[PDB]
Amino acid sequence: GGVQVGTGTAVESIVRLHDEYSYYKLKGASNQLEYTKYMASTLQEIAQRFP
Amino acid sequence: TLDKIQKKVNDDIKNTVDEINKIGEEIATINKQIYGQEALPTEHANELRDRRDELELTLSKLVSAVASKNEINQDNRLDTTITDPGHQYNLSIEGFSIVDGI
Numbered sequence: 001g002g003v004q005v006g007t008g009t010a011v012e013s014i015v016r017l018h019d020e021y022s023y024y025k026l027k028g029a030s031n032q033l034e035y036t037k038y039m040a041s042t043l044q045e046i047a048q049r050f051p
Numbered sequence: 052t053l054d055k056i057q058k059k060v061n062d063d064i065k066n067t068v069d070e071i072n073k074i075g076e077e078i079a080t081i082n083k084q085i086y087g088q089e090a091l092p093t094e095h096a097n098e099l100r101d102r103r104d105e106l107e108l109t110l111s112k113l114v115s116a117v118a119s120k121n122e123i124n125q126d127n128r129l130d131t132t133i134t135d136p137g138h139q140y141n142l143s144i145e146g147f148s149i150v151d152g153i
Contacts, residue, residue, distance in 0.1 A: 002131030
């Protein structure tokens with residue numbers, strides 16, 4: 001009716017869920033830097049080529 | 052760059068919503084449990100209380116911090132000896148609060 005009591009528990013499997021965001025912060029700044037730093041190395045090289 | 056930062060905070064806003072709901076409901080679920088006919092068992096009870104209270108401050112970080120607290124009693128005449136969230140546990144928010152504490 002309304003008078004209550006409790007008991008135990010059981011198990012079936014194991015888990016690892018999904019939640020990613022702060023890691024994006026550094027990543028975005030990275031690959032743009034990957035474009036720039038590569039380009040910088042090659043571009044400066046390109047500058048001297050036939051001086 | 053300015054716009055990306057503007058978009059980013061909007062992403063911060065949109066991301067903040069689901070996590071608050073994600074973390075908030077977990078707390079709310081924990082409040083469901085703490086608020087059955089919950090004459091809480093001493094040793095592990097106050098741990099249930101303290102952990103739930105402990106998690107309040109982490110909630111105050113992102114959102115309002117103003118909630119109402121009380122407590123209730125029970126007897127071997129267990130009846131429907133329920134423990135309340137409503138006046139006992141409810142947050143203030145948005146100008147008018149219509150909220151269940153669980």
